[PDB]
Amino acid sequence: RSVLKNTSVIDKIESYVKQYKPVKIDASKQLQVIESFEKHAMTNAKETESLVSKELKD
Amino acid sequence: NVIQDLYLRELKDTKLAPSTLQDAEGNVKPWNPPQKPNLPELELQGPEALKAYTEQNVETAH
């Protein structure tokens, strides 16, 4: 800003940056899809685990 | 002598020059704000995809 001699447009873009200081807000979207996926995955994981464990002792 | 004459003449007779900020604007890039702060799209909701996937690939282990 001290480089520019036309400064009153550096004050403008400073205020534009500080205005638009939120440049995009938070994204958490893995909280609906992750749980659904986890239920089916857990079910299948446990089923396989139990089946083969049973077979091991068999 | 002549140094003084020129020095005097120049300094005194010119000390304003043109300077319009508006003309400057034409020659520089304009500040405009970012676009599309778009939140991510949510996809593959439900175990619908998973049930489909378990079934879909016949080879689940071979």
Swiss-Prot record, chain A:
* Entry keyword set: Acetylation, ATP synthesis, CF(0), Hydrogen ion transport, Ion transport, Membrane, Mitochondrion, Mitochondrion inner membrane, Transport
One Gene Ontology term, aspect cellular component: proton-transporting ATP synthase complex
Q: Quick one: a GO biological-process term for this protein?
A: proton motive force-driven ATP synthesis
Keyword Calcium carried by entry:
no
Q: Where in the cell?
A: Mitochondrion; Mitochondrion inner membrane
Keyword Mitochondrion included in the entry's annotation: yes
According to the UniProt entry, its GO molecular function terms are: proton transmembrane transporter activity
> Would you say which domain of life the source belongs to?
Eukaryota
Oligomeric state and interaction partners are given as: F-type ATPases have 2 components, CF(1) - the catalytic core - and CF(0) - the membrane proton channel. In yeast, the dimeric form of ATP synthase consists of 17 polypeptides: alpha, beta, gamma, delta, epsilon, 4 (B), 5 (OSCP), 6 (A), 8, 9 (C), d, E (Tim11), f, g, h, i/j and k.
**What does the protein in this record do?**
Mitochondrial membrane ATP synthase (F(1)F(0) ATP synthase or Complex V) produces ATP from ADP in the presence of a proton gradient across the membrane which is generated by electron transport complexes of the respiratory chain. F-type ATPases consist of two structural domains, F(1) - containing the extramembraneous catalytic core, and F(0) - containing the membrane proton channel, linked together by a central stalk and a peripheral stalk. During catalysis, ATP synthesis in the catalytic domain of F(1) is coupled via a rotary mechanism of the central stalk subunits to proton translocation.
Q: What else is known?
A: Present with 6820 molecules/cell in log phase SD medium.
Q: Which family does it belong to?
A: Belongs to the ATPase d subunit family.
Q: Under what name is this protein listed?
A: ATP synthase subunit d, mitochondrial
Q: What species was this sequence derived from?
A: Saccharomyces cerevisiae (strain ATCC 204508 / S288c) (Baker's yeast)
Gene name, per UniProt, is ATP7
The stretch of the full-length protein covered here is: 60 to 117 of 174
Swiss-Prot record, chain B:
The entry's localization annotation reads: Mitochondrion; Mitochondrion inner membrane
One Gene Ontology cellular component annotation? Answer: mitochondrial inner membrane
Give the chief site where it resides: mitochondrion
Would the keyword Membrane turn up in this protein's UniProt record?
A: yes
What are the protein's UniProt keywords?
Answer: ATP synthesis, CF(0), Hydrogen ion transport, Ion transport, Membrane, Mitochondrion, Mitochondrion inner membrane, Transit peptide, Transport
Which GO BP annotation is one of this protein's?
cristae formation
Q: What role does this protein play?
A: Mitochondrial membrane ATP synthase (F(1)F(0) ATP synthase or Complex V) produces ATP from ADP in the presence of a proton gradient across the membrane which is generated by electron transport complexes of the respiratory chain. F-type ATPases consist of two structural domains, F(1) - containing the extramembraneous catalytic core and F(0) - containing the membrane proton channel, linked together by a central stalk and a peripheral stalk. During catalysis, ATP synthesis in the catalytic domain of F(1) is coupled via a rotary mechanism of the central stalk subunits to proton translocation.
List other remarks. Answer: Present with 6140 molecules/cell in log phase SD medium.
Q: Subunit details for this protein?
A: F-type ATPases have 2 components, CF(1) - the catalytic core - and CF(0) - the membrane proton channel. In yeast, the dimeric form of ATP synthase consists of 17 polypeptides: alpha, beta, gamma, delta, epsilon, 4 (B), 5 (OSCP), 6 (A), 8, 9 (C), d, E (Tim11), f, g, h, i/j and k.
Q: What family is this protein classified in?
A: Belongs to the ATPase h subunit family.
Q: Know the name of this protein?
A: ATP synthase subunit H, mitochondrial
Query: Species name for this entry?
Result: Saccharomyces cerevisiae (strain ATCC 204508 / S288c)
What fragment of the whole protein does this chain represent? Answer: 33 to 94 of 124
